[PDB]
């Protein structure tokens, strides 16, 4: 997902 990237 793009929450930690």
Stated length of the chain: 5
Q: Any idea what DSSP says for residue 4?
A: T
Q: 2: which 2 tokens?
A: 């793009």
CA distance 4 to 1: 7
Q: 1: which 2 tokens?
A: 């997902």
CA distance 3 to 1: 6
């Amino acid at each position: 997902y793009g929450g930690f990237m």
